[PDB]
Amino acid sequence: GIGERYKFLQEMRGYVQDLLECFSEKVPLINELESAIHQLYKQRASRLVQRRQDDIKDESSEFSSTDITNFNLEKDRISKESGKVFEDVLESFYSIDCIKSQFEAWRSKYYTSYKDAYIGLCLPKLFNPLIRLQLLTWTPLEAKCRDFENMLWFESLLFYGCEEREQEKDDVDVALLPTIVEKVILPKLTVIAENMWDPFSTTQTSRMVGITLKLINGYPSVVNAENKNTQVYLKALLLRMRRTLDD
């Protein structure tokens, strides 16, 4: 099986060589595209916080959409632009089910070699451009945004490693789900909450309490109250309100 793997690995290197040659230009662009939507959200946030506070001040003293549509058109443009900076790349480099199938077959042929060499830890790095690309403009609180269950990375991996055998603490697939959710999704969720969420929307606030509990209830082993990244996520949510009062 190493001889067939050697053939496969040499084919893989050429396959990845075209990807990385392309990526030499596209890796700076990932940072640029991520900055572009965040600055656009910053433009949205700076304009809307200033104007809506004046509206809320009048409304609160009483009791004591145009920009959003314009923003959505440019947000969709950046979303499509991000998918067009990666449209000139083969489907096999971004279809997560195709990638998963290769590594599952790799483990199915070389279980000992996959577990001992921690080959599964290469998956979050290969998915690192992919997860950042898919979660780029994503914010599940908006009226036209997809839920986290409606993405390739979550659905394919939701039962990955959830085998009927007793969960060993060092089983690479059993450890894959904590690693991707805690170390990749939660920092991304922190960046999303700090730079993209608009706390004044009551509807988003209703979704916020629901969606936070949903993640905790779906992964009580990982997304628990003791988890430092979950704590960082919970702390960031409160701090975003503070900054929203400062701006």
Binding site: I2, G3, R5, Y6, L9, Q10, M12, R13, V16, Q17, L19, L20, F23, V27, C122, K125, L126
Partner: peptide, 28 residues
């Protein structure tokens, strides 16, 4: 960037490991 060195390393490791597996086969 990391994928270039890491994936190619496995190719060079497999060529070495074939000699190592043969050495381990011979020893056993």
């Amino acid at each position: 960037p990391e994928l270039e060195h890491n994936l190619q390393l496995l190719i060079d490791l497999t060529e070495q490991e074939i000699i190592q597996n043969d050495r381990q086969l011979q020893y056993e």
